[PDB]
Design a protein around this ligand. Sequence first.
Ligand SMILES: [Mg+2]
Ligand SMILES: [Zn+2]
Ligand SMILES: [Zn+2]
Ligand SMILES: [Zn+2]
Lengths: 191, 562, 568, 104, 145, 83, 99, 93
Amino acid sequence: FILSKIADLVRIPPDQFHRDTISAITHQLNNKFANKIIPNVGLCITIYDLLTVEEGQLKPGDGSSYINVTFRAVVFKPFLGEIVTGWISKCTAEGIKVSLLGIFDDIFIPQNMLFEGCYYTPEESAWIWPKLYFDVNEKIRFRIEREVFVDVKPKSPKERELEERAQEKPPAYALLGSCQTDGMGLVSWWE
Amino acid sequence: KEVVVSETPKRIKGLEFSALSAADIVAQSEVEVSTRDLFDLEKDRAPKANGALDPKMGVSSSSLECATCHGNLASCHGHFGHLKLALPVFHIGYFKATIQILQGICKNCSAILLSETDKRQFLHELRRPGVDNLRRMGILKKILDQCKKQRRCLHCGALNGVVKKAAALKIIHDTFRWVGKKSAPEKDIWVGEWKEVLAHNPELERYVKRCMDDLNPLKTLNLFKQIKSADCELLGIDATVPSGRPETYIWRYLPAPPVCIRPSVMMQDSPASNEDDLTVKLTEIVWTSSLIKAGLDKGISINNMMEHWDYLQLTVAMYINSDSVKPIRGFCQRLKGKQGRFRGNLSGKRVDFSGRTVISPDPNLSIDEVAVPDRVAKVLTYPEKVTRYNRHKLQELIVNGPNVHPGANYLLKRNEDARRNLRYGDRMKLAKNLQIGDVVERHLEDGDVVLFNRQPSLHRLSILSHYAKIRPWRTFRLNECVCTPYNADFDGDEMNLHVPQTEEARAEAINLMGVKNNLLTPKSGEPIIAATQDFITGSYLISHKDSFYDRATLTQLLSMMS
Amino acid sequence: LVTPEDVMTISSLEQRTLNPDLFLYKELVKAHLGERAASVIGMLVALGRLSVRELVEKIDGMDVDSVKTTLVSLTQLRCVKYLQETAISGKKTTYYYYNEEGIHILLYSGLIIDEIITQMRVNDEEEHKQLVAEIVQNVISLGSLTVEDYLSSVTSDSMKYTISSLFVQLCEMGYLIQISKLHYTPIEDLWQFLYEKHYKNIPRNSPLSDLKKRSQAKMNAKTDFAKIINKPNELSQILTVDPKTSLRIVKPTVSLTINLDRFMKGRRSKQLINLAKTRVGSVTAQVYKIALRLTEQKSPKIRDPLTQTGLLQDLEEAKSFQDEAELVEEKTPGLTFNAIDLARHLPAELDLRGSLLSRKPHSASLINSHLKILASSNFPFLNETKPGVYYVPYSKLMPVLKSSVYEYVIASTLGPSAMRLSRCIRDNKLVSEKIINSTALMKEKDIRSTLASLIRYNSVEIQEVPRTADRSASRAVFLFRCKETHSYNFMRQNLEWNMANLLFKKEKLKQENSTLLKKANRDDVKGRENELLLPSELNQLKMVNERELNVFARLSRLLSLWEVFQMA
Amino acid sequence: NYMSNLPFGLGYGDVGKNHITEFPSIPLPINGPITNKERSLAVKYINFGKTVKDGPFYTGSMTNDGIERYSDKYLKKRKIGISIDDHPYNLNLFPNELYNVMGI
Amino acid sequence: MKVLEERNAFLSDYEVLKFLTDLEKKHLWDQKSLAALKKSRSKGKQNRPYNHPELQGITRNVVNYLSINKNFINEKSGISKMSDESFAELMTKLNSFKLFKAEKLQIVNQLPANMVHLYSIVEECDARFDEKTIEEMLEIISGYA
Amino acid sequence: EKAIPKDQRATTPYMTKYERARILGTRALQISMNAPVFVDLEGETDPLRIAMKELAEKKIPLVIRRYLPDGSFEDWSVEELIV
Amino acid sequence: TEGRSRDGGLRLGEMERDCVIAYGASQLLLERLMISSDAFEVDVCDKCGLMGYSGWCTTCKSAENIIKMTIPYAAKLLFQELLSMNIAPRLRLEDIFQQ
Amino acid sequence: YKGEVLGITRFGLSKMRDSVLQLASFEKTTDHLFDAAFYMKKDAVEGVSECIILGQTMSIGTGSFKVVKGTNISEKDLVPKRCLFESLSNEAA
Ligand SMILES: [Mg+2]
Ligand SMILES: [Zn+2]
Ligand SMILES: [Zn+2]
Ligand SMILES: [Zn+2]
């Protein structure tokens, strides 16, 4: 959790001219930044406050107020030294699908930077160890090392048409964990 | 997921005019056109791949799919196709440009006819912060004339002379225009070469006359492709960006237009669809290109290919600009003319929500009013948005409907994209469900701002803004006081009425072009809306010194006055 | 049917519209120095003459310091020429050219150090090979490598003594020439600076007219420009000084930069040797390898003495420069050698005993026989002025060499009948539609098929014969022409564009393989590549490494083709 | 109607397809077999360019956290690059505008 | 749209909790939203033509993740009951414990009462200090517990 | 890109016909978009006439940004622009 | 359309355009000549001034720089005709806002 | 005002306008367009003719100024608020 100063142009419809300007601005900004991921900036939750509010200028055809506003918004940004308590929700023999209560879940962990001895099986046996393991939907503890922003998306209209008729990298922000040190992986290994 | 998406309104700051290089033509094109056939009797006249009417370039009717964007005629923006031309050809619009380019350079070593330190003073002058079109043409013409004066090139002086065209559409260069009483190694080589010819031709003695350095498009493309980027600026072709290379100005790839650019009409004369001029010309160009390509893998007569290749140099000429020997309508015919493209569609066009009928007088009308027929008031609508202030009024109008004049023709819901015709649908429910964002296209009403215009529109007072007044008859009635700015005289005159459709346009009309705000002509400031003939006569007869009125007559006069 | 999306990605259509002169050098600087340097050099190529502020306002890099650093890097790399032209009524600002010959150093680098390695008389010592390879690699990678830097670098004196020993030899071959102001200024601007002083040195009211003052000014300008170019083109003044009780030493203060003129003379000699090997059997072809090897060192200028690029050639009486070039060619006594001179440099491997047969041990008489067959051969390899001593001419060998190499490249590209028609249109001047049949006597079908296939290039010219006053080529028969100049022009452009395609391919492979290349080019990884690498990744590394080796082999094999069209 | 312009040497089957080969194909013979000398040319080529890029002559470049990990404390520096001004050069061959970047 | 700078001021995981709490009390109340309203706003687009989708979920998920008991072991929420003075009374220890690291946001909300926890939070800890200053830290960060 | 400070201003203090027409158009468009009005309607439904009434009462909350040709601009509220 | 039997519209010629200009009514010009005659929502790429379709530039194949704006369909037709010849009328854009 | 008497003839209109759209709308459409494309002209959209052709607002009349709605936001509700962890961490060094 870190703030971030973002400058954006915000359009306030004339319907919202009755409410006060700061509340209208924060409403529109929340609509633009509710659960959105800012490209290669991370995931936003809401907006903290506003810093500079320029006068709202009108284009010759709209009638709405277009306001240049500067705001700080809360961003989930682990860099390298953060331990988190996730809630796993899916298990697959490529690294367990660690997840949250629903803030954001698409993050993955690879086994190689997890404990070496932990290995997957086709028979769906949890873990094999040289003495203890865990099952799905339980507290986990891990780290963060590097961040990969998926921001490449060339999608042609006819390719999208064929995909729609037939009906991947879903996120622009993911997390990478590691359990190289004793303890992390569970908050109740001893005592 | 749900990454942030940003939209910022933008305007067109400027235009960059250039040429589409061969790379860009294929970059924009979504198909190549190669087959000379638009339809086959085998496919039952259904447009199939690589034809001139390939649907991937768009559709000609609103019941077809593009296969590029999958939209009908009302949605497809049109898509491009490209032609690969074996033995590329000259460019008619760039013919003068190529003539001037070949003047500035020598055709021997592909080097500019400018000293590497002489015109650099004027090159430096070109970077003046304040440079106009007159300045650009001035230094460019000076450079061209200096190159014309410069006979011998600094890399290879072969006596570059004139680059005059053929007496055709060909380029012929006088290699030895300025020779006399002089012997050179080039002259000796030429003399030996034509002594070799004279000894094997008993009749070429007369025909060796003329036969100077002819410049074909293929040679020019090869010579242009040898021009370095360094001396492109002195040719006026900025080579900073790709496609600034002069060789891109030679016709090599033909960007065949989208189908929407050249629509194919439905059911003219014969039951079969009728094609159009640009389609036919590109079909023929495809045919001749295929023929010339086939001649490369078979070796047709070089004289015969010159016939077909020269026809390619022609068939593109009136494909772009029909000038040479004539009803063939090319591209430059679409843009030129009173009914062309610019003067016919860009600056001046036909407009919606307008009417025209005979004008009749009306003294009981205010000078800033026009009497509008209820018959045209029931078609000419204003798209009023429903607010907290007019919702009951718009509900009453919707209940009235499209057949009773204080009514409405269409309703556009806030969350919908198509307007609901009010002829059908039990308008009672729509009136009840009217929201605060819907649009009611209600009939023209009293006090509506309308534009009123009589042609010819000589001065700006030929079009004024009035307040509509709905009346039973079929004429546009106006106060005779406001006939003078229009130059109208109720002798059968017809005037055009325009209904502005937006709030800003309506306010601008009634505030700047209103009759009350335009009682004086801006040419001199003298009043122009005033009494006409019978009003002047009646005023004179009233104010005449013999006119005496008792109390009853005076009060009746005042009551008629008001 | 190919899709427009499918082409322009695997078809390289968008690279066909780049001018090869800009594309090649841009790609070279991209590969070697960096993208800012390449952008600067590309702006310099597109805009031949511009200042630093022009770079600031044209390149997106709107920074004085960054442009300054990139430009100083390019100037150190000998890839940029500069000048300071003074505006008297105000402030002077320096302008910037781009060095053409400088970029060949990094380009020809492999061939450069290869000819360095294989050219030394003493090459059988492995350590000496490594020393000379490393020293010439350092000089071409650093630019102006200097003794006061390298001697201070080397940590032991005895290996410092050899460094100075190699320098004097390497300068005498001309491989290390003294850099100066003559190596950063344009030739036309030098000619103008030496033409405007002499137009200003003439006092008024002299009886001579404008023509005579112009003639005297131009001859004085020619003579002093020739002196100023002759002084640093070949000199040993840096090697002249000798301290007491010490060996001959070069000036340590001066900066030693690798030359290209004598190396490219050696490359031309090497290509002529390969021509001889292809032309004549190896018995007396072996003697031709060292025959040109004793003249290549002091060989004259290949194409232009730089008196033909700085000014317009000539309008009236234009043969004077060819006349003076051949005059120097015949007036130079050092270049000419006798058979006694050659016997002192012939290797012991060659015997020259069975190389002759008069009728159907290093003897100067037999060497004279090879020299006579060379002089009287169909290609003018040598010309005889006096009995026993001849010389290598260039006033009549360059055109035939260019015609042969060009025409044979057409031979390698097109078919046999195309070769035949090319030969016919070359030898028989101004051929026609009946003259081709009269002088060819083969099948007209293939004749005109290959003819049409050959019209595409700049090989042949098409003429128009107007039967009437107005010119229509479909009304009357037309004849052909030669115009060999455009044909030679094409071989430049096509070859440089194909080269630039090679460098684009290799740099794009690098751009898609950068992570693996970075992992490879690590000190501890280097030499250890079969142990700490995953199977598929290491196998892919071998494939991409061999692919780069193949592209380099193709590059080198192509590198024997463009210089022979880079002459006059 | 432009459909009857056919030379006697030209038939009907060939015309109509057109569309050209996507890239012109003439196999150049400069891709012959490799030898030891050619492999050595490739090796010396890859050593070159790599030398100038590992040197100070790059001028090409256009985890950055404002907070320093304790691992980054007392950790090895990447490489102390020799600056362009750091390497000595000859003033007589560089313009006056380029002197400021250099260390006098 | 342009982001001025990525790394703005850090957030202690009590400032975020109180921010989301004052947000919930200012509007978008959870106990109020769980009730029904037949009339609604009557304007046409929600109460005073507005609605809050995609934001109530995110302001619930974060606040619930904070309100869950801190995972020192497998009674309170753990973040709820520290007042402002409760965090202003910690200076003489928080800013006296020299760490040469801005990693203080780790131990204010997670991993108390475990030496391995702190040894992971600050790297190379035992080499840096393993004598006596490894337990009073746990006691103080467990003081609220 | 520099606003002239309010204390001194060179442009005219009177409202031009174009300024009045554009202000009325903008205000009427806003009213037609259900913006609140600061005038007593007395049963008027036309947004244009409501805007004229607000202009007569000088209760239009818009300012006029008059750009000088040199690029600067001075801001004039509808209230301070005298008719 | 341009006929009474075809339910045609009334042409606002260059003369009426001149009169409306002389009035200084920019919004009325826009409404009569663009909104009420031929309004087309085109896709214009910000990188190349070339019109796209369905939010796709189909020349850089990126869809990243595509901007949405309304222009006369006559202007769109003119640009597509100019691209048919060897003219590339590249549109440069700028924000109305940010001052 | 250009220093020479320039007419209202087609040749005169090519004085300094550089507006290829306006020139082509006036007269000689094709030659002007092709010369502009060949010269790589970069004409901006500033005239009323070009603005009408492109559907833009002209800088004349009601388009010669800008309407701006004052936000009426005070300077007490714009400063950052509730920030102390950064101060604590800075004082920790
Ligand atoms: Mg009449
Ligand atoms: Zn389509
Ligand atoms: Zn020349
Ligand atoms: Zn694009």
